[PDB]
Amino acid sequence: AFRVLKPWWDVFTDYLSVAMLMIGVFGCTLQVMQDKIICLPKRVEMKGLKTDLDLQQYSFINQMCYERALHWYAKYFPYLVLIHTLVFMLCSNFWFKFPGSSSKIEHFISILGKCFDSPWTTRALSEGEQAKALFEKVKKFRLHVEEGDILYAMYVRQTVLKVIKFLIIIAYNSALVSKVQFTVDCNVDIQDMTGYKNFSCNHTMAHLFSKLSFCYLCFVSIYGLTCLYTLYWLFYRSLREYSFEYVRQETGIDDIPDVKNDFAFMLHMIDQYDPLYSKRFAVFLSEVSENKLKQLNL
Amino acid sequence: AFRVLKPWWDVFTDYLSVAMLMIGVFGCTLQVMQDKIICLPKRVEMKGLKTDLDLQQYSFINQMCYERALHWYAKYFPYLVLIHTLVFMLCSNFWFKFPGSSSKIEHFISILGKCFDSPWTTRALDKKEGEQAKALFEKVKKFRLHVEEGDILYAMYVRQTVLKVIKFLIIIAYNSALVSKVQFTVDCNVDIQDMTGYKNFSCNHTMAHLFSKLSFCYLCFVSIYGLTCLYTLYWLFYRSLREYSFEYVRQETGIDDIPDVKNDFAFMLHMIDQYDPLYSKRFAVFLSEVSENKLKQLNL
Amino acid sequence: AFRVLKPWWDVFTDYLSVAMLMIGVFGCTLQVMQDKIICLPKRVEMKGLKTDLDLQQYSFINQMCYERALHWYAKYFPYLVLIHTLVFMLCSNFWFKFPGSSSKIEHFISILGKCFDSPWTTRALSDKKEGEQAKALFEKVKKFRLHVEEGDILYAMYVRQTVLKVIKFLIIIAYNSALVSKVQFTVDCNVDIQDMTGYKNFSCNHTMAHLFSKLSFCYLCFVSIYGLTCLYTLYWLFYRSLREYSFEYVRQETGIDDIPDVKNDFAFMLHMIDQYDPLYSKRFAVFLSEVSENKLKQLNL
Amino acid sequence: PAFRVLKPWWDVFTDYLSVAMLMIGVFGCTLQVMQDKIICLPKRVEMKGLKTDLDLQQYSFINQMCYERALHWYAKYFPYLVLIHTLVFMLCSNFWFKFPGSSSKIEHFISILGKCFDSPWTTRALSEEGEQAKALFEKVKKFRLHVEEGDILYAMYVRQTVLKVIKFLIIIAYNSALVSKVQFTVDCNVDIQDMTGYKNFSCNHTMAHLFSKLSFCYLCFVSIYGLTCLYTLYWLFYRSLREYSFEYVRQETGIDDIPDVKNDFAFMLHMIDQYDPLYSKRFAVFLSEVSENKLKQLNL
Amino acid sequence: AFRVLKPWWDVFTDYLSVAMLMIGVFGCTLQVMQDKIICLPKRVEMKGLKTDLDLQQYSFINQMCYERALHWYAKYFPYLVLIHTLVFMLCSNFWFKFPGSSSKIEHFISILGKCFDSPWTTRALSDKKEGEQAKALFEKVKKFRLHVEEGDILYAMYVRQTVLKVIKFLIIIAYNSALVSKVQFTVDCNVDIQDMTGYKNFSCNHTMAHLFSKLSFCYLCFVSIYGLTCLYTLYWLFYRSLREYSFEYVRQETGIDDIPDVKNDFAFMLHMIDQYDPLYSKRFAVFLSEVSENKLKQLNL
Amino acid sequence: AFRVLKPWWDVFTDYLSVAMLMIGVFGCTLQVMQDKIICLPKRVEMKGLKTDLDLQQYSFINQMCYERALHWYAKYFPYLVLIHTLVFMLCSNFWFKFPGSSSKIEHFISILGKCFDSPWTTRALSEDKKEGEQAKALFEKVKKFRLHVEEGDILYAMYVRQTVLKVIKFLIIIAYNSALVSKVQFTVDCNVDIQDMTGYKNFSCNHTMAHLFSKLSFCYLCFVSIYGLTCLYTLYWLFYRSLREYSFEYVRQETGIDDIPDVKNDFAFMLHMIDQYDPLYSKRFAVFLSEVSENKLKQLNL
């Protein structure tokens, strides 16, 4: 369960996150494969040129120039992708779970389920003890939940954190992508034990990392666009008070009150999945149905 | 139960997509498990030639000519086929998982599945059956009232099919365009003279002859896929889908008072009647108030 | 499940297909695992010859001759087997997953399964629910017979698929027997790479020659058996009017001499289900007599 | 499953032997392509070493040539024959479950026996309803009309063991005949002189002394299998299978009115009594008219 | 189910056999990885010595001396251990399978269990449902007393299997003591390959010569312990007269001097079972006297 | 099931045994993976020395010195660790699976579990026919068990035997492990007589995985040391409380029923073991041991 509070901008984000994870794991796999750098000593019929270097001196040169000339971005790109995917997924999961605010969600889901299976909605639009108990417990839930600010402000905090993390990711990926290069000009001072001073190196997974970087940049661009749209949606209509106006006109009940804060936010969240549970809640919220039920009882 | 709303074209295209995925992954896995390019210098009884090159200079030349001589298509073909296969998969399944387009579909399928085991159909042409049938009538009436004005369950289908058609066209375009560039032996002209001593090289691409065959197979499969998509698009345009005609049904049933439904209900009725051209008649039975009149007359 | 509507051949050939697939993949296990063609230059007590070649020139020569000398059949043998096995598996399954050709299958299977367990079957030859149960199954039989007794849509596809399978069997035998003799162990390689290696003519050995030849012979045997089974089926479909069925012997045995003789698609499916168990036909024909309707209405009232 | 009751001791013994043969064959195949098969050196028809002056690929060429030009076909393709024959034994031992003729009758028989296996009427009548007992009876009477008409479910079990026995005989024949050709040191005389420089070679087959012991173990296993097959063939012949005699039941029961059946049902009774000797006694009680008449009289 | 019938030595020998299997498989899995032989030619400031041999002549020498210089015991140590361990496993739990050997044990276990908790035993030692239960107990007691008296089918097999285990012990310890000194580190390989390598005498080192040695000792030790247990079993099967049972102490303790002596298979089974628990014997003996039947008949009325 | 009958000192050792097993397998795998001894010849601007040895000469030298230069501890430490851990596990899991002394265990567990939660227990300690009948049956089961168990001494000798065996094993382990721990060193000197085969007589060798073993060795000792202490404590517990006899003193005073007897022998030892887990199961059992309870149930039957 728990999928009812999932607007269209919450499964798309999960798909984007899993795609980013796939990109990162592919990058790490390619990192572990291949021989990485390859360096040769620069000198500054067509017979070959004899460098006269042992088999271990090549390994020494390659290892020294792999951590002396390559830019720090070209060596730790998949790791950064993995870290950012991890933090995005954790931020997505942290809001809902919050070990200490989940019960308010499970009990609310149970309330929605019970109000969904009630067949009295049809009669109201135009076993009594069970309904009375349901009304009493719904009143208890209202009085218990309608007070605090714990389901709106922290959602905004999550979204703002996501947007700022995005802005930073775009910021430093845009600049540090022209430094992923194929051929580099390693220049070290190992002259008394190798014999050569200037070496030219050829990083292998350069173009592939450039393509992966472009793909990752586009995927984030879409993710940040989604999060920015959500934040703007939360900050141009002020979804803190819910006005039950159309329900009153299209239902006939004239005693429909308006709820405020967290319950209003949860109603706002629900309507994206199906704009019909508010119908059941409005029908169940009237005090005249219980009056008629007890009048019939007597 | 979603397979009912899946005509033959949308199982044939699904099998085509699966085959595309398998060929693409085969190519991708074969690419790595191979020695790739191999280059040698050019000298522009028999006795061998002494090049006097080290063991690392060979690797240097190989991995330099790999990215300085080979065409971009010959290197990233499995990746392209994987990407396009993934788009094709998440281009036809998107019309189901979009929020706001799922509740109507599940309600429709529930009503259709339920409106099959009703004795009234047999009797048309005991307390439980009457109340259950009345509940079915009320549910159908309210659902019809629901899906009558907001007609977003059909434009998405045409849009996605058009997207598939245009993607197919471009796929064919630049696969036929750049399929003759996958050659076996190539010439590499890189300027590394003070490092290795040779300026001109001749290279062989190990997987050049296999990639051509896989490209041809992919071209054939995508051509068949595009032909199916064009047929579906044509079927979606040769007569209005936002209306239905219970012409012969009313004539052969003698209940000629049922109105002709339109918009989303009509379109899904067109889609479903292809799978089984009988269910529509069942719906007719549970769209006439005359059945309710018979029920009330029998009760009263 | 969907196993009753399958004669012996349709459960025999199936095994062959999977067997074929195994051979296919088996080849693919080695075609990329074992070391491929090995080539040496040719110069046309005992002391060896110094060719004076590096270790990369050897790889160059090997993978150039591998594609400039070997026949196109010796390299792609497993892939053709895999493709043909897959397409046979597809053709044999173009029977249950084609909208417009599966509704009748499921209807008939469900009706047969529910009718075989009906008590009226054993009561005919010597309650409350059974009344309307038998009634409803009777209208279901009536509507089914009025439904699937006009067009042979589902009998015109079995013939099509079997004919295509026979044609493909012929093609496979033809071209596979044509080129089975070109898989050779030792070959000659005449490529003009002298400015880069110094040697013009090479002699090569293809590592997987005998193994491919033996696998090819096994594949030919399997395909021949497959084609013989398909030929038997084709002969089975044309030696009488398969589109008509007569309820004569059942009437003689039982005594209810009023069940009509069906034709077309339902007759075809009844023949198929008869090729598996000669008991279903009678158990269903007993629900086709007007006298049975009279007995049912007398019992109910 | 529900078909596990048709397994005498020898059938399960043969299954265990066959899985053991498969294990040996897969072990042999695993060792086949994991080592270097052959090692060949040229022959030259103070102590110092002698230099061949051969490259590192001419050794591979020589090894690969002499491996398929000097080794007997038995030493190379040994494990595959073991796998083929184990697979064929597995197939032959089960070619009477999948045939439609035998598949239907076995299922019907097991269903009838299972239905009779949970009938409290038998326990009540022996130790100390209606339609279920009555209906089960009518099935039995017609059951011994469909089954006792020909040799279908019994002819297979006698026509397959003969094939198994003959296949065992031929296996022993050409496996003992060609076990002395697995040599360790062999000679190779190939005419490759203008390419390598040496004409005569001496070769060692690394996996020679192990294939001999594997062959001996395989011969022992197949010999035990063949002894089992001969035992079951003799058991199928020393006394008639087409007839079953209800002899001891008459003395141990006293209800001397049960007739004796023949043919496929007789063979099935033979096998089931070879199984746990408790199904026959339970099933025989549904053949006496006395119990049915008593039940009818009591009910009416 | 049948574990209650297993005395201590059965589980002890089972654990020992499992340990033998463990060490054998450990030896085999160490051999598969690192087992090899290193051979060098012999020449019967400081500088190194040049042998002037390629990388293939070393492999030739190694794999020739590996089978012309190593004793067959060192080559295959763990395979024999595995074979013998499997033989011991099959020898154990052998008499449980060849005969029926399922009813004769399970029924006895069930009767002993339901005789253990019979309230009549407690009533005597200090409705109709109890009467019929006791009658059933007595009648099946007599039924098995008469039925099983046919020979020795659950007794001779035990002696046969113990004897076979003892003989396996004797032979195994014999030839493992005989050959344990044939495993060495350094060996001399005198093979005649002179025109192909140039060297006639070689000295070779075996990798796991000091390992297979130590393991062997451990293995031997385990076997030794095994044998002792088996010997004890033979002492138990040879000293006590298991073919007859004598109900002596019950007569003096209870005073009801009418219980007859049981013999043969039931005597042996009681001798075996009383080891697990010396209380089931008296519970079984209670239901063997005619006075108990007389009391049962009197109470039934 | 087998949880209540396990004091804390029998679960601390359970954790320690698995810790030792994992350390041993870690050592074994790190041994099988990495390279063994590496040896070089000795010569008993700078320029390198050319030994002039082939690639198989070096393998021969390494393989011979690995066995002619290394002390047997540095060679086979981890298998000793594994053997001793397995022996400890066998010792600790002995009396649960020894025929002739295991049936009593589940009999006692079942009886105690049955009488732990019964309405009659609550009713009797406060001051239907089915409940009375089941209580009566449980009374007979307890009465027969008392005579079934309260006569032998087999479940007490085995416990002390296994504990003393574990203690002596711990002593031996610490003894020789401490003795042979300074012989696991890094650089060793190899002196083999091969002059006609390789050309060099004296070699110097380095054992690759030496220091690591030493580290592991110390860890092992610590665990064993702790293990020993635990065993010692248990060995002290058995020999100072007089575990043979059990007194129902506290139960009588806090319940008032002055007819519960003092049990001895095997049953007393089992009660001593169980009350070390939670000291109220004894009360629930003692409820089902009073003739007063039998008389009360007999009266309530009427």
Numbering used by the authors:
A (entry chain A): 16 to 59, 95 to 176, 234 to 405
B (entry chain B): 16 to 59, 95 to 175, 231 to 405
C (entry chain C), E (entry chain E): 16 to 59, 95 to 176, 231 to 405
D (entry chain D): 15 to 59, 95 to 177, 234 to 405
F (entry chain F): 16 to 59, 95 to 177, 231 to 405
Original paper wording:
We obtained five distinct 3D classes for the 8C-8A(IL125) chimera. The 8C-8A(IL125) maps showed no apparent symmetric arrangement. Therefore, the final reconstructions were done without enforcing any symmetry and resulted in five structures with resolutions in the range of 3.4–4.0 Å. The most apparent difference between the structures is in the arrangement of the LRRDs. The arrangements of the LRRDs in the other three 3D classes exhibit diverse arrangements and subunit interactions. As a result, several different subunit interfaces exist between the neighboring LRRDs. The distances between the subunits forming the tight interfaces appear similar in all classes, whereas the distances between the subunits forming the loose interfaces are variable among different classes. The distinct arrangement of the loops formed by D50 and K51 is also observed in other classes. However, the number of subunits with K51 pointing toward the pores differs. For example, the class 2 structure has only one subunit with K51 pointing toward the pore, compared to two subunits in the class 1 structure. The groove created by the distinct K51 arrangement is located between the subunits that form one of the two loose interfaces in the class 2 structure, despite the presence of two loose interfaces.
